[PDB]
Design a protein around this nucleic acid. Structure first.
Lengths: 48, 27, 286
RNA sequence: UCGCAAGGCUGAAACUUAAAGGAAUUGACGGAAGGGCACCACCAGGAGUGGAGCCUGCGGCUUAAUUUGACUCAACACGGGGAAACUCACCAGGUCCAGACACAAUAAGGAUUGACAGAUUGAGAGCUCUUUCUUGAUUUUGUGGGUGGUGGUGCAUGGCCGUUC
């Protein structure tokens, strides 16, 4: 588990064609920055 | 025409035979 | 015949594509299916076969379903619409049409520029159209070669109109409000302009290209100035141009002496005054 | 490590991939052309265009109207359309006429019917029954299922012959 850094910038390693509502996150056990994902996608409203 | 087409161009009222100018080489 | 009204349904989806595929159909004639995306870097399935089925009816591309060598071809509008699109891309044509004029491989299409003064989109389609292996190869390059051979006396002090762009079949020639020698009625200085027909081929031998082809449609007393009628010469005499090395100048040189003798005499019953000139001077004074 | 050197010997990971590789084969397209054999093409020239007035036929201007489209599939037939109002696919203005089937208001004191007499006219008409009187039970209407598919474009299904072979 880790904090969400921010909204994510899409760099094409193919193919799902949208800004995928993904989350730049950085963990707290380590602090090593990983791009993440949510399924059931959309609903970009309900956490900071 | 004779009922095996939807023929709308080059229509015929002449002489009751219903065979087109484009249909002397088909019909 | 002609279609024009199959173009304005598109988006950016074909604008990155064109001169990548136009330089890509030349590098690699008939293009198969999954390459329109990947010549232009367009993405695989974000508005793609929607846009290619949009292009499909428009006759600038066609679905040539051959056996695993498929065809997407940039029919005859793959040059024609897409050179209209190219002049939209090369900043000359902003919309299509105020156009009147008919030839075979030169249609006069009267347009207004980026400036606002008019010019003419002449279009090249020979064989009518017959556009095939060399016919497309001609109208691509005879738009390019005759972009190079309409300046042979403009630099040298004489009157040849100037070409502007050579997009795929299109040659843009100001526009010339001519008056050919079948339209005119009278003249104010007759005997100057008969001996200047010996003397124009004198001028043509300076540049090394003798032109002959003079019918009654040729020499336009044009409109440079409208009000005071400072006219000029447009000399539609070009395509009988012959390299003088070839063995036909025995009857090209003698045309310069005794073949123009009818038109200022008969058309303009008035038997003429002036002298003449040969081209024996122009053999040395190039 | 070995060599004066150039290099020689031993040899990874970070990352990225749905592939890289082996031999083997079937037939489109040629920028291969043969012969045909075609005078709907070529040589010898005829008829003659190519310069013009018009029938006949369109793309263009102009429209309430200067209609229209595919088959031998295109530069063509004008679709027997050379044309009169009709033709003739469009136009300048009007109305004969929509509620049946159930029950609900009036239903035979006139709901709504007709062999007729007028007003009749909108740009020129038949139609109506308020102002003779057939009416004959029946049918008038704010309504919805939709019986009304005299909306079939059809989706193919069943032979049958234009078409494709």
């Amino acid at each position: 588990k880790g904090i969400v850094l921010e909204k994510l910038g899409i760099e094409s390693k193919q193919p799902n064609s949208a800004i995928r509502k993904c989350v730049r996150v950085q963990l707290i056990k380590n602090g090593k920055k990983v791009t993440a994902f949510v399924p059931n996608d959309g609903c970009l409203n309900f956490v900071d | 025409q004779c009922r095996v087409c939807s023929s709308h161009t080059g229509l015929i009222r002449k002489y009751g035979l219903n065979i087109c100018r484009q249909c002397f080489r088909e019909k | 015949k002609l279609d024009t009204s199959h173009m304005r349904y598109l988006t950016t989806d074909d604008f990155r594509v064109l001169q990548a595929v136009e330089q890509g159909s030349r590098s690699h004639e008939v293009v198969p299916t999954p390459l329109i995306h990947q010549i232009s870097g367009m993405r695989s399935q974000s508005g793609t076969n929607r846009a290619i089925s949009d292009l499909a009816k428009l006759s600038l591309i066609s679905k040539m379903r051959n056996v695993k060598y498929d065809g997407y071809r940039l029919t005859y509008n793959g040059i024609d619409y897409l050179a209209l699109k190219t002049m939209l891309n090369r900043d000359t044509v902003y919309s299509v049409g105020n156009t009147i004029g008919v030839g075979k491989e030169s249609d006069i299409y009267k347009v207004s520029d980026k400036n606002g003064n008019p010019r003419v989109m002449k279009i090249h389609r020979l064989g009518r159209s017959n556009q095939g292996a060399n016919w497309m190869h001609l109208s691509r390059l005879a738009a390019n070669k005759e972009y190079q051979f309409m300046s042979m006396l403009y630099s040298k002090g004489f009157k040849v109109p100037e070409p502007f762009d050579n997009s795929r079949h299109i040659v843009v020639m100001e526009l010339i409000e001519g008056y050919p020698m079948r339209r005119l009625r009278k003249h104010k200085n007759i005997p100057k302009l008969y001996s200047d027909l010996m003397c124009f081929i004198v001028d043509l031998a300076n540049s090394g290209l003798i032109h002959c082809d003079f019918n009654e449609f040729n020499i336009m007393i044009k409109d440079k100035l409208e009000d005071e009628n400072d006219c000029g010469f447009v000399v539609i005499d070009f395509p009988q141009c012959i390299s003088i090395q070839h063995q036909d100048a025995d009857y090209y040189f003698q045309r310069d002496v005794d073949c123009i003798r009818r038109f200022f005499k008969k058309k303009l019953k008035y038997e003429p005054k002036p002298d003449s000139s040969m081209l024996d001077t122009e053999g040395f004074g190039d």
